[PDB]
Design a protein around this ligand. Structure first.
Ligand SMILES: N[C@@H](CC(=O)O)C(=O)O
Ligand SMILES: N[C@@H](CC(=O)O)C(=O)O
Ligand SMILES: [Ca+2]
Ligand SMILES: [Ca+2]
Lengths: 240, 240
């Protein structure tokens, strides 16, 4: 089971407006990884310029006291995952990210490292999407075609990051985020969808899940009214 | 070739705020279908309640002087397409729509009816997406998984419907529509992306294409600055 093995920090978004990269969650990253993790394995696949992405993430994690290895600089990404002390998958285009995880044979390897070996996993945004059962509730454009929407399944429910309340000033006739999720929940056997607004994130420790941050999360359950939850809320019931 | 065979009316959105279903484009529908088309074959697959969707579309098209058959009430959808005088694919969830076109074996049948038999095609929003080479530039959530993102290819370029200018009042850190398309244009061999704002639509007659409506279209070319185009603009250069 998961009880003493699963460690996830699932961030909705990397940056608050006017703030620094990972600044709003930097204390939680520090607590989550702890003092005994020396190096973090970064996965930059969600963005096109992997070199510049790794440089940005390395600057921040080195400022936090961690070395940073990018899997795109490893000659054997599978081996890099098998040796990682901690894994951070950054945001970007979720379809591009998931296809690249499949293309580099990393789905099973990351699953084993996190769920069986207890290696801590950080996701930001698209990296949070691929931590879930599937990317059915990403906001991103399908710029490439992954072989499946199934992802790492580190948790069995879906997440909608960057969750956005409807705009009352708006005459735009496109779907609201809630309307899009409602349509998902018309399809067969779909699981709960956790809408993490920007500024909030989910800490998973075994079979415990906790909302952290400074904003509310909107939970979408199939056939039910959406419910709103304050930082500190216990989401353990979403875990098996 | 296409010169005297292809007839498309590609609408960005069905309804102006405060207006009626297809009201803003109803005159163009009338000119496009003409007086000799008696019945329109409707494809409601983009929405979950196909019965209610067909009822809504039937009310409008009957008010415009056309009978309406919904392919979801046909016992052989392929045969219904082969006999259609005109085809209208309505908006909804583009992934759900495309998967259902594939599931009902309608991609080839619709392609033949439109491109070889000269049958007029109307798309609205998601129905405009599936008229293009692929649905890579839909705004919709991947609530189901079609076998491919390739669509009808009635035109060889991509369309982004409901195109939305960035919000200057907004502190939301999610991608702007332009940022999403730019990422598409980082992938290999991608074609032009026509951003149809709400209120504008594309009329295709053979190898001629014209912007119609009351709003501007933003054209995205790979590696180039986006360009803005007024109603009446000649987009024929996007066609082969
Ligand atoms: N593209 C987003 C993910 C999403 O909104 O689904 C990000 O990684 O920032
Ligand atoms: N879901 C939209 C299509 C899109 O925005 O891509 C519609 O059919 O209205
Ligand atoms: Ca991010
Ligand atoms: Ca529509």
């Amino acid at each position: 089971m998961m009880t003493m093995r699963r460690h996830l920090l699932l961030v909705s978004n990397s940056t608050l407006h006017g703030g620094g990269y990972l600044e709003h969650c930097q204390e939680h990253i520090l607590k989550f990884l702890g003092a005994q993790v020396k190096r973090v394995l970064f996965i930059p696949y969600a963005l096109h310029d992997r070199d510049a992405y790794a440089k940005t993430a390395r600057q921040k994690f080195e400022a936090l006291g961690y070395g940073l290895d990018s899997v795109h600089e490893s000659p054997d990404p599978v081996d890099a995952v098998k040796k990682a002390e901690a894994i951070f998958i950054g945001g970007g285009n979720t379809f591009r990210l998931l296809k690249a995880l499949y293309d580099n044979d990393l789905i099973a390897a990351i699953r084993k490292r996190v769920l069986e070996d207890g290696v801590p996993y950080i996701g930001s945004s698209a990296g949070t999407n691929v931590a879930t059962i599937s990317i059915n509730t990403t906001n991103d454009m399908p710029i490439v075609y992954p072989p499946s929407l199934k992802a790492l399944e580190l948790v069995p429910f879906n997440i909608n990051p960057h969750y956005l309340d409807p705009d009352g000033n708006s005459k735009h006739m496109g779907e609201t985020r809630e309307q899009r999720i409602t349509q998902y929940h018309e399809e067969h056997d779909t699981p709960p969808v956790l809408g993490l607004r920007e500024g909030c994130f989910l800490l998973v420790e075994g079979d415990k899940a906790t909302l952290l941050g400074i904003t509310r999360a909107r939970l979408f359950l199939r056939g039910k009214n959406p419910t709103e939850h304050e930082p500190g809320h216990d989401f353990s019931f979403l875990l098996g």
